[PDB]
Amino acid sequence: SPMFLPCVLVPNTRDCRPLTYQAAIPELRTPEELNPIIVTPPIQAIDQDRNIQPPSDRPGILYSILVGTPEDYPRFFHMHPRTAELSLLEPVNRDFHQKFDLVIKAEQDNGHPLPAFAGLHIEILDENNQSPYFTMPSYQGYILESAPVGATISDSLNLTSPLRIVALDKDIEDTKDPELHLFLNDYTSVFTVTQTGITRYLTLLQPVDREEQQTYTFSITAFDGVQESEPVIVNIQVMDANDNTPTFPEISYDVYVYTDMRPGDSVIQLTAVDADEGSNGEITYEILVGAQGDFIINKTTGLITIAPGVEMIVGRTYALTVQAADNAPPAERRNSICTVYIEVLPP
Ligand SMILES: [Ca+2]
Ligand SMILES: [Ca+2]
Ligand SMILES: [Ca+2]
Ligand SMILES: [Ca+2]
Ligand SMILES: [Ca+2]
């Protein structure tokens, strides 16, 4: 006799469409967090005649859950008899409960129950409740300092394959992009990470200079819109290019020697500078021409001395063209020239 609202007319008839009220419940959230459970549309039954006039208070209607499936619903739900307010009693685990289908009873309390019934369907919702994660505990990358902007960080010294950063999330099914946001905690003006895909890569925003900074250490944090991952730590090694030339302090050197000096005496100590790494910075000194057999230089020290079995003479002048070269492979080798002007003087 009472009718649930709304009465949706069945066209070409005078009948109300049977109602199935709808509710949805986020898995694992507490009654405190969720109550009261919002029902769409709101549950409500009214009386037909007499109540042609303003009902105001005291509807005289009692609500209850008549029956439901699965049968443990009483464990999770309670309905208030007068207000039909739906209360969750315990958090719901979707692994065990995906849905409930209940039957709602509405009857009068005057002693003459003429029950009415309606459906109530309750979905248990999956939620973004798993933190994203990286599939490696850390990441080691390599980049050649001569790499241009846009270059991809490599995962080995060979620089043959890109550094792969895989960020997953258990809320997202396999082989599907979890659409995570990745935060870098440092060097965001130097490196950037690709912004889509299950596998991410690191590329250069700015060129890097090994001679300026040879290593970068920072951490990446994934974010799914709700929870962050643990930060994962990253080290990037900048690899040396032979992009520095062995350099003398000056273009030419004026030096005087003396007649009483003999084989094995320091004439001048030349020192060139190469900031590159290892053999790329390893300098070799050579007199190309001009010594006339009277002077030699130490290949590794750069010290010029008197040649063996050689005696100075008073007026003699020399123009030594001295080369400093690094020990990179010939294809990448760099060098520069210093001219040493030597003049013999009396003591
Ligand atoms: Ca989930
Ligand atoms: Ca998630
Ligand atoms: Ca450099
Ligand atoms: Ca060099
Ligand atoms: Ca270099």
Swiss-Prot record:
The lineage of its organism: Eukaryota, Metazoa, Chordata, Craniata, Vertebrata. Antiparallel heterodimer with CDH23. Found in a complex with TMIE and LHFPL5. Interacts with LHFPL5/TMHS; this interaction is required for efficient localization to hair bundles. Interacts with MYO7A. Interacts with USH1G; this interaction may recruit USH1G to the plasma membrane. Interacts with TOMT. Isoforms CD1 and CD3 interact with TMC1 (via N-terminus) and TMC2 (via N-terminus). It is found in: Cell membrane. Expressed in brain, lung, kidney, spleen and testis. Found also in the inner and outer synaptic layers, and the nerve fiber layer in adult and fetal retinas. Found in the supporting cells, outer sulcus cells and spiral ganglion of fetal cochlea. Expressed in cytotoxic tumor-derived T- and NK-cell lines as well as biopsies of nasal NK/T-cell lymphomas. Not detected in normal or in vitro activated peripheral blood cells, CD4 or CD8 lymphocytes or NK cells. Isoform 3 is expressed in brain, heart, cerebellum and kidney. It is linked to Usher syndrome 1F: USH is a genetically heterogeneous condition characterized by the association of retinitis pigmentosa with sensorineural deafness. Age at onset and differences in auditory and vestibular function distinguish Usher syndrome type 1 (USH1), Usher syndrome type 2 (USH2) and Usher syndrome type 3 (USH3). USH1 is characterized by profound congenital sensorineural deafness, absent vestibular function and prepubertal onset of progressive retinitis pigmentosa leading to blindness. Usher syndrome 1D/F: A digenic recessive form of Usher syndrome, a genetically heterogeneous condition characterized by the association of retinitis pigmentosa with sensorineural deafness. Age at onset and differences in auditory and vestibular function distinguish Usher syndrome type 1 (USH1), Usher syndrome type 2 (USH2) and Usher syndrome type 3 (USH3). USH1 is characterized by profound congenital sensorineural deafness, absent vestibular function and prepubertal onset of progressive retinitis pigmentosa leading to blindness. Residues 17-134, 135-248, 249-347 form the Cadherin domain. Glycans are attached at residues 158, 298. This is Protocadherin-15. Calcium-dependent cell-adhesion protein. Essential for maintenance of normal retinal and cochlear function. The chain holds residues 263 to 608 of 1955 of the full protein. Cadherin repeats 1 and 2 mediate calcium-dependent heterophilic interaction with CDH23. Three calcium ions are usually bound at the interface of each cadherin domain and rigidify the connections, imparting a strong curvature to the full-length ectodomain.
